[PDB]
With several copies, the nearest count.
Chain A
Amino acid sequence: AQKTFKVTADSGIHARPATVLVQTASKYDADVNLEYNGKTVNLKSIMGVMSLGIAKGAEITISASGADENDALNALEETMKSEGLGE
């Protein structure tokens, strides 16, 4: 599955929310990935994600290729807005 969100966070994707997200994307067996400006990184990984520097006012896509790639995006969409991180 997949979906495109627009970072609304005043500070982009960083701090606690980034962790909260990465930690969620790592609960499922699905291989979640973050596609931004072309480069992609494992969402279950901190170094990679935070290395991107997702500042505010941008767009991304959340992958999902496993036996729950749907239960993933739903929960991922959850925090994605629960932590005020776009929609």
Chain B
Amino acid sequence: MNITIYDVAREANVSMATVSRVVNGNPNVKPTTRKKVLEAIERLGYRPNAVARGLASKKTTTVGVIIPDISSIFYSELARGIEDIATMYKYNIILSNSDQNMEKELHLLNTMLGKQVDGIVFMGGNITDEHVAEFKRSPVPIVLAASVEEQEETPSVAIDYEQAIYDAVKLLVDKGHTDIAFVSGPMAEPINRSKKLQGYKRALEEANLPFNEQFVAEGDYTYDSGLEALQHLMSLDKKPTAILSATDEMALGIIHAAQDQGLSIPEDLDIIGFDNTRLSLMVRPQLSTVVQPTYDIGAVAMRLLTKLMNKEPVEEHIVELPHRIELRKSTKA
């Protein structure tokens, strides 16, 4: 009950509506008036109450960010992009981890809308038809970031994970490789079984090279799984000449796994990672990676939201940011 827009209006012999216009920087206010009221504010140390503002205006200038795991070298960066563009457009963020748990996901979605957020950026690995359903009956806009939605009807920003792999794969072919291994992530997530995997097969198929299941390992985005991957590969009768990884951490682990078994990279084996996180540069030898503009993905995602929130019209709700391979010293020449 201390120093409110009321206490100010009195200190300035003017009405609340004036203290309002003044506080929310409205044109309609005699520079003399604006002066006085501004004086009073600094005289009582007035700090506007955002919640009351939210009740009356019907908008909290805060968005909901649902991310699977913020401790990730990947999402962290993905978030930083979102946070920046939000602060650029004067928006606060409500962060919360889902750890890919559909229950916790859909839960958060509610809790958030409950907090009355103006919009939400969603990053999940398994967008079900129910998820899409829930996204359709939301009072506020929802934008996907670096995620895959088969139904593709909810707006989102990302790259073409299908084409990325294909390129990386075709690139290895165009260097005389015939037995390329693909170390993926959980096949449960469509991005791995419906996107990256298919791109990997469509590459060999166009190169007329037979599809060999053995050459397909399933990791779990974890560095350790990157070692168990190289093993199960350099353990087969017919071993690969080059291995593509769906994640930098895993790939970064493929390297070391082989560096322990006396194998020397890139002299005895070609390696390629995916994402292009600072990680790549912190390996030895440097790692050749498929570049995905993570920070950009987040920033363009949050930017798209601001648009959809201010109800601006937008051509194409689904955005594809360009990608590219970046070879370092993880491969030959």
Contact = CB atoms under 8 A, between A and B. Distances in A.
A55 B276 CA distance: 14
Nearest to A55: B324
Q: Per DSSP, are chain B's interface residues mostly helix, strand or loop, or mixed? A: helix
Interface string A27-67: 00000000000000000001100111101000000000000
A10 B309 CA distance: 34
A19 B321 contact: no
A39 to B, nearest CB: 12
A46 B321 contact: no
B264 to A, nearest CB: 27
Given A46-B300, A47-B304, A51-B319, A15 B295 contact: yes
B212 to A, nearest CB: 34
A53 B321 CA distance: 7
A23 interface: yes
Contacts of B322: 51-53
A73 interface: no
Contacts of A23: 88
Given A46-B300, A47-B300, A50-B321, A14 B293 contact: yes
Contacts of A19: 84-85, 88, 299
A16 interface: yes
Given A19-B299, A55-B324, A50 B88 contact: no
Contacts of A80: none
Given A19-B84, A55-B324, A47 B295 contact: no
A55 B322 CA distance: 10
A50 B84 CA distance: 14
Contacts of A85: none
A46 B299 contact: yes
Interface residues of B, number: 16
Contacts of B324: 53, 55
A14 B88 contact: no
A76 interface: no
B295 A46 contact: no
A46 B293 contact: no
A24 to B, nearest CB: 12
B303 interface: yes
Contacts of A53: 293, 321-322, 324
Contacts of A14: 293, 295-296
A18 interface: yes
Contacts of B296: 14-15, 18, 50
Nearest to B293: A14
A53 B322 CA distance: 6
Contacts of A52: 322
A46 B86 CA distance: 12
Nearest to B157: A47
Contacts of B321: 50-51, 53
Interface of B: 80-81, 84-85, 88, 293, 295-296, 299-300, 303-304, 319, 321-322, 324
Given A19-B85, A47-B304, A53-B322, 12 more contacts: A14-B293, A15-B81, A18-B299, A19-B88, A46-B88, A46-B300, A46-B303, A47-B303, A50-B296, A51-B300, A53-B321, A53-B324
